[PDB]
IG gamma chain C region (Oryctolagus cuniculus), 429 residues
Amino acid sequence: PPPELLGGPSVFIFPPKPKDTLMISRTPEVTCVVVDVSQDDPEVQFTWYINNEQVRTARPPLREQQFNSTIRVVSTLPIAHQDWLRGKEFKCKVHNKALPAPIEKTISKARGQPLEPKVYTMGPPREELSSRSVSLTCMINGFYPSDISVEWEKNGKAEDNYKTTPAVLDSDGSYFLYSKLSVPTSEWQRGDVFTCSVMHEALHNHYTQKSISRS
Amino acid sequence: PPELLGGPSVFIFPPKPKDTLMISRTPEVTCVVVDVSQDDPEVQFTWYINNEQVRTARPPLREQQFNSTIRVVSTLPIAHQDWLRGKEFKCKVHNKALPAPIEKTISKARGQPLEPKVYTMGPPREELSSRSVSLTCMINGFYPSDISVEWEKNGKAEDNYKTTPAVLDSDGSYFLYSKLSVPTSEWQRGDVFTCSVMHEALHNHYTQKSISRS
Ligand SMILES: *[C@@H]1O[C@H](CO)[C@@H](O[C@@H]2O[C@H](CO)[C@@H](O[C@@H]3O[C@H](CO[C@H]4O[C@H](CO)[C@@H](O)[C@H](O)[C@@H]4O[C@@H]4O[C@H](CO)[C@@H](O[C@@H]5O[C@H](CO)[C@H](O)[C@H](O)[C@H]5O)[C@H](O)[C@H]4NC(C)=O)[C@@H](O)[C@H](O[C@H]4O[C@H](CO)[C@@H](O)[C@H](O)[C@@H]4O[C@@H]4O[C@H](CO)[C@@H](O)[C@H](O)[C@H]4NC(C)=O)[C@@H]3O)[C@H](O)[C@H]2NC(C)=O)[C@H](O)[C@H]1NC(C)=O
Ligand SMILES: *[C@@H]1O[C@H](CO)[C@@H](O[C@@H]2O[C@H](CO)[C@@H](O[C@@H]3O[C@H](CO[C@H]4O[C@H](CO)[C@@H](O)[C@H](O)[C@@H]4O[C@@H]4O[C@H](CO)[C@@H](O[C@@H]5O[C@H](CO)[C@H](O)[C@H](O)[C@H]5O)[C@H](O)[C@H]4NC(C)=O)[C@@H](O)[C@H](O[C@H]4O[C@H](CO)[C@@H](O)[C@H](O)[C@@H]4O)[C@@H]3O)[C@H](O)[C@H]2NC(C)=O)[C@H](O)[C@H]1NC(C)=O
């Protein structure tokens, strides 16, 4: 017994990944997803706008049959990095015969003066040194907007064994988060250097890093 | 199960960890019904614990919404141990517009509870030139994710702290960090600050860790 789809399709819009918007070598994209498209009225057209001016995307929509007997259609719009970072509004309008009227969704970066992250590394608590692994902490305070990218390296090589908290709204309207890298105690004790790297739009060259090793 | 488009929807919410973990408080499970129509405003709730029907003394609260709908809230006070021992709480929602009653269930995450490891860390040396410094409480290795974290100075509750959501770690336990912002002058003169944690895996459901310059 398939869905009745009495309301017709629904549309959702998604922002680009922060790392894509912050790296010139990458191509950030805004994405418009349409769900609950019926087999009977399967055709979907997208119109894209930037600040209410129509733009073209050179990528045809991706159409996918779903388990619940519906169709899902995805339109992707590659954008200029500064269009996003300068706060322009991106709009997608969706056309479908099952719709009483075209559906519009809009998205843009959070408004307000960007504020630079202050990045700090902290070593393992003394209590932890007796275990097989220790925790290295990267504290990242005072940034805005919340869009940010955090990674860890060792010897110019990416580290994988880390977890980062969601960004948290602080009392002054800025955001903070922490990232925790788990490393073998032997690596810490022998003097390996670990680096927290951060990308955010308010940083010079959108990049900063802070290192830490046993003293 | 027959789903009505535009009809009411139900969401169920767990008790607050601090309520569950303090014998003096009363934890409650909450059932919220939204998109209730003006034409059919009456909503009845039935509650169950492990499928045994129970009564709540709390009449449902009906509230008009800015979006022209009605929202109805039902609160079920529960025994601390019913939550902590993993019983299933079920709310069944009755409304004339619904083709069938809507049911939602909730229970504590299953698995051996694991005790949080609590650590405090002082401010980065770089902050010392500022008018305020950040004190960090790192809390690792706990399960389930239900936890309460506060800060004190001597014995009084502190202001100006924020705590991250719990994050799922690589070994399936959870961690979080809490940040307390204090005047640099207070830190420099050796004031004592305390990170306090309540979690079901702790002895007496409580532990704390202090931090000061000396
Ligand atoms: C039949 O089966 C269908 C398929 O299963 C099913 O379709 C689903 O319908 C749901 C609604 O009925 C719909 O639910 C929405 O989900 C939103 C989030 O979904 C993202 O994450 C999900 C996992 O949690 C994924 O499953 C989704 O695919 C989606 O994944 C994201 O996709 C984007 C675009 O691809 C992607 O970004 C892009 O990534 C690429 C790389 O791949 C590049 O980097 C691009 O640059 C980049 O653009 C993300 O990576 C990816 N994210 C993740 C996590 O993976 C959710 O946000 C929606 O909630 C909002 O709306 C509801 C109700 O309207 C509100 O109650 C709720 O509060 C939310 O409100 C929004 O909140 C915002 C602020 O927080 C606010 O700003 C917005 O304004 C506000 N929105 C509005 C206007 O309300 C929503 O729940 C779901 O996505 C569908 N599933 C899929 C797979 O599409 C269908 O329902 C079935 N039909 C029937 C009848 O059963
Ligand atoms: C008309 O207007 C109404 C009112 O705005 C709209 O109703 C909304 O509908 C949404 C869905 O359509 C629904 O979204 C779900 O949200 C939940 C989480 O919501 C919590 O957090 C929100 C903030 O982010 C709040 O706005 C919500 O009110 C809710 O807050 C929580 O409330 C709890 C009970 O009061 C409270 O419990 C406390 O702790 C215990 C309870 O037992 C103690 O007793 C204590 O006393 C309690 O206070 C929580 O602490 C409190 N939490 C917070 C953070 O404040 C979300 O989980 C859920 O997402 C699930 O499902 C979606 C799919 O829908 C899925 O994508 C997710 O993966 C996930 O599984 C829903 O998104 C809103 O909650 C709801 N808003 C309200 C106010 O009820 C209507 O939608 C509007 N109608 C139309 C047509 O537009």
